[PDB]
Amino acid sequence: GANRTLIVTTILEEPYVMYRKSDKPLYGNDRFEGYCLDLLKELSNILGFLYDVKLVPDGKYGAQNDKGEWNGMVKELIDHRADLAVAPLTITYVREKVIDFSKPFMTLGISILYRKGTPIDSADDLAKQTKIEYGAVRDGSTMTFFKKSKISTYEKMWAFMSSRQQSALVKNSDEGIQRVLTTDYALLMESTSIEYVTQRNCNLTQIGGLIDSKGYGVGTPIGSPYRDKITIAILQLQEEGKLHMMKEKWWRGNGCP
Amino acid sequence: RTLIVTTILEEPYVMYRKSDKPLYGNDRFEGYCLDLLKELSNILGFLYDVKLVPDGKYGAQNDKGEWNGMVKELIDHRADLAVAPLTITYVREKVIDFSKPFMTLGISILYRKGTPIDSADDLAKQTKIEYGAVRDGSTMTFFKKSKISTYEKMWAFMSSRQQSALVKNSDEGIQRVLTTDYALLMESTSIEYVTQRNCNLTQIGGLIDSKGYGVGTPIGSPYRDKITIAILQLQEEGKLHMMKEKWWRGNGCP
Ligand SMILES: N[C@@H](Cn1c(=O)n(Cc2ccsc2C(=O)O)c(=O)c2cscc21)C(=O)O
Ligand SMILES: N[C@@H](Cn1c(=O)n(Cc2ccsc2C(=O)O)c(=O)c2cscc21)C(=O)O
Ligand SMILES: [Cl-]
Numbered sequence: 318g319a320n321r322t323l324i325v326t327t328i329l330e331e332p333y334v335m336y337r338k339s340d341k342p343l344y345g346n347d348r349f350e351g352y353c354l355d356l357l358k359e360l361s362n363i364l365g366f367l368y369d370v371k372l373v374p375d376g377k378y379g380a381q382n383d384k385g386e387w388n389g390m391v392k393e394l395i396d397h398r399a400d401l402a403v404a405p406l407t408i409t410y411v412r413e414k415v416i417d418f419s420k421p422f423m424t425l426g427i428s429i430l431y432r433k434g435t436p437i438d439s440a441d442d443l444a445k446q447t448k449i450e451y452g453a454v455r456d457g458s459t460m461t462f463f464k465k466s467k468i469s470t471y472e473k474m475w476a477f478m479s480s481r482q483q484s485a486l487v488k489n490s491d492e493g494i495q496r497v498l499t500t501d502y503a504l505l506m507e508s509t510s511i512e513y514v515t516q517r518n519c520n521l522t523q524i525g526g527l528i529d530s531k532g533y534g535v536g537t538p539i540g541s542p543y544r545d546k547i548t549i550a551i552l553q554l555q556e557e558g559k560l561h562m563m564k565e566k567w568w569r570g571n572g573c574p
Numbered sequence: 575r576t577l578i579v580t581t582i583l584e585e586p587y588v589m590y591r592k593s594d595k596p597l598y599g600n601d602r603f604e605g606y607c608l609d610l611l612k613e614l615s616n617i618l619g620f621l622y623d624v625k626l627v628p629d630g631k632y633g634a635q636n637d638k639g640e641w642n643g644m645v646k647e648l649i650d651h652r653a654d655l656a657v658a659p660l661t662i663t664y665v666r667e668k669v670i671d672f673s674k675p676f677m678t679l680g681i682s683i684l685y686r687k688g689t690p691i692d693s694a695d696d697l698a699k700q701t702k703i704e705y706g707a708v709r710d711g712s713t714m715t716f717f718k719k720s721k722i723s724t725y726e727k728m729w730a731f732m733s734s735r736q737q738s739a740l741v742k743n744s745d746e747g748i749q750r751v752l753t754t755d756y757a758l759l760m761e762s763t764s765i766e767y768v769t770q771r772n773c774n775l776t777q778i779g780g781l782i783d784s785k786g787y788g789v790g791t792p793i794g795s796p797y798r799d800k801i802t803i804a805i806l807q808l809q810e811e812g813k814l815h816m817m818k819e820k821w822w823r824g825n826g827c828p
Contacts, residue, residue, distance in 0.1 A: 408674065410806040417799075420662065424678055424784045468812045526780070530678045530809065552664035555784075558721060 323368045323543070326390045326399035326536075327353060328376060332513065332567040333405050346370045352567040353403050356422060359559065360403075360535075363550040364543070371399070378406055379536075391416055394538045401543065402536030405509065407458070409531070417539050419547040421532020422560060427459050428508040429524040430497050430515070439525040443503060444474045451503040452478040452485035454493055459505050460486065462529050471528075474505075497521060509533075516570035576621040577797075580644045580653035581607055583626060586767060586821040587659050600624045606821040610676060611657050613813060614789070617804040618797070625653065632660060633790075645670055648792045655797060656790035659763065661712070663785075671793050673801040675786025676814060677763065681713055683778035684751050684758040684765050693779040697757055698728045705757035706732045706739030708747055713759045714740065716783050728759075751775060766822060773827035 327334050327349075337343060337350035346354070349370055361368055379391025379402075387395055390402040394416045408418045429451070431437060443451045451474070453460035463475040478485035487493040487504070494514055496502040498521070504511075511523045535551070537544040554560050581588050587607040591597055600608070603624055615622060625647075633645025641649055644656040648670045662672045683694065683705075691697060697705050705728070707713040717729045732739045741747040747758040748768055757778065765777050789805070791798045808814050 408806070410803065410810050413803055413806055418674070420667075420672070420674060424786070465810075466812055468815055471812075527678075532674075532678075549664065549667055552662070552667055556664045558719075561722075 323366050323400035324398065325357065325368045325370045325401045325403050326373045326393040327370060327402065327404045328373050328378065328390060330405055334372075352563055353405075355563050355566070356554075356560075357403050359554055359563075360547060360550050363553065364546050366543070368401070373399075373402075378404070379412065381411060387415065390536060394536050397538050400537070400541070401547075404536075405533050406536050407531055408534045412536075415539070417537040417541050417544045418534035419537065419544050420551055421534050422551045422554070423509065423533040423564070424530070425508040425533070426527035426531055427462060427505055427529040428511045428527060429503050430494070430506055430511045430521060431503040431524045432497070433520065433522045437503065437524055440474060440505070440528055441470055444470050444477070447477070449501055449503055450481060450485055451505060452481070452487060452493075452496075453505045454490055455482075455486040455488065457490075457506075459507060463505070494518070494521075512568055516568055516573065519573045575619075576623060577654035578625055578652065579611060579622045579655045579657050580625050580627045580647040581656065581658040582630060582632065582644060584659060588626075606817055607657050607659070609817045609820070610808075610814075613808055613817070614657075614801055614804045617807060618800050622655075627656075632658075633666060635665065641669065644790060648790050651792055654791065654795070655801070658790075659787045660790050661785050662788045666790075669793065671791045671795055671798045672788035673791070673798055673805055675788050676805045676808075677818070678784065678786040679762045680781030680785060681716060681759055681783045682762040682765050682781055684748070684760055684768065684775060685778045686751070686755075687774055687776045691757070691778055694728065694759075694782065695724055697778075698724045698731075701731075703755050703757060704739050705759065706737075706741060706747070707759040708744055709737060709740040709742060711744075713761065717759070748772075770822055770824035770827070 329335065332351055333353040334349055334351045336348060357368065373390045373393055375388055377389035379387060379389030381387055390399065390404060390406060391412055393399040394402055408421060429440065429443065437443060437449065453463065463471050463478065466472060466475065487496055490506065490510065493504040493506065497504050498518065508527055515521050515523050535547050586605050588603055588605045591602060591604040600623065611622060627644045627647055629642055631643030633641060633643030635641055644653065644658060644660060645666055647653040648656055662675060683697065685691060697703065707717065717725055717732065720726060720729065741750055744760060744764060747760065750756045751758050752772065762777065762781055769775050769777055789801050
């Protein structure tokens with residue numbers, strides 16, 4: 318409706334959403350910059366909606382209580398306190414049962430963060446061996462995937478990183494990067510994050526194809542009239558190659574040898 | 575409830591099961607897509623009859639804007655689902671409803687092993703090694719419409735000389751890679767299926783132009799959300815990974 322302004326829930330995450338810096342006072346949506354803002358601007362332009370960006374108040378993506386209770390941007394959608402979530406919000410089984418997702422505007426998975434010029438080319442290569450230690454941030458989506466996987470190779474990798482846990486499982490992504498940087502360690506991690514780090518640590522590389530295929534989708538409340546239009550606009554933008562440039566724009570470092 | 579599912583003959587998604595005796599109905603077919611179908615059938619609780627798309631097309635538009643293929647069968651409500659490697663695309667999604675992708679892919683390179691070529695850029699910066707795509711296919715289209723300069727450069731190369739670098743179809747392209755110093759740009763799934771069966775070939779570089787296959791339904795279908803969710807379940811159960819490995823794995827390339 319022409320009257321209505323859509324509330325867009327989102328979350329602070331480099332480089333999707335960041336407070337912008339400026340020599341002049343900023344207001345409203347203008348206070349933010351980033352990939353997700355560009356995406357939003359493009360979607361708004363195509364669909365004709367006006368929007369109002371609000372950080373999710375608990376600052377979480379959206380997970381479920383041991384007691385079936387949701388938080389994060391997911392909870393905002395369920396309660397119709399937001400019309401859209403535009404953020405690196407992973408499409409998953411549990412989430413898709415409580416809210417509606419547009420098709421992925423970004424497609425990703427788990428990948429390997431490691432050094433250059435080694436025989437290592439895949440998870441399989443990692444799994445087939447023990448001399449180079451590999452792992453994940455403790456209790457991350459990446460680690461959770463391995464823990465829960467019924468796929469032989471991954472089952473083997475989990476046994477590995479759980480067996481060496483004090484070593485193999487790191488506190489957070491920062492410490493994990495340092496491990497790769499400081500040790501003969503390979504870090505499994507959400508591919509997009511790996512790609513960001515790679516553009517800024519010239520002696521790091523992203524190894525292998527993508528494991529655990531998944532996408533980021535714009536979240537909507539079940540039944541939302543906008544979801545379908547948003548899928549179409551996303552595809553339009555992929556068609557025009559515009560998503561690739563947006564990715565490029567916000568992921569690019571300042572050069573790498 | 576019984577659903578009509580349109581699909582299309584395609585290795586290794588849909589194939590004639592080989593048997594000494596006569597086979598009937600759904601039992602005639604096997605492949606990655608019949609496995610997915612059975613698997614979504616069990617989660618959603620539906621019966622289905624597999625119907626090969628009569629014109630044997632995926633689905634595209636005339637200059638009039640008339641559709642064909644499985645896409646047309648959906649628009650006309652002659653199928654309830656299309657379960658096949660149907661690429662989710664902008665123009666298709668305007669006329670049919672897609673589930674979220676059960677397989678993600680992109681464009682990659684098909685070449686021989688043991689050369690220094692590691693990327694499209696390595697191919698682009700050079701002329702001894704010929705490279706191309708199938709004429710009029712999605713790969714060519716992508717390359718033709720691309721504003722990325724490396725790709726613009728590759729495109730000018732491919733299309734030069736009455737397009738001697740293009741080929742009529744992927745079988746011809748495959749053979750050309752096999753018998754000639756020639757690299758083939760193509761849909762990565764088919765590339766992987768080929769490398770599994772030609773030990774001296776490989777995929778060069780990574781994926782470009784990300785995209786995915788979804789189960790098509792007619793606009794407004796109640797099955798779309800239910801299949802999306804079944805697809806996510808199967809992904810998390812790791813069943814998609816197993817289905818993929820089952821049908822893609824060759825006989826070992828030692
Ligand atoms: N997409 C996620 C949020 N999310 C996310 O989980 N991770 C993964 C992660 C974060 C700390 S450890 C860890 C791991 O994978 O081991 C991201 O890297 C990320 C970048 S943008 C949004 C992200 C979501 O929808 O919940
Ligand atoms: N997904 C497509 C159908 N389709 C497809 O286009 N290609 C690629 C291709 C075929 C001839 S040229 C060409 C190219 O990449 O240049 C496939 O390899 C494929 C494997 S299963 C379904 C497939 C569709 O929805 O129309
Ligand atoms: Cl962290």
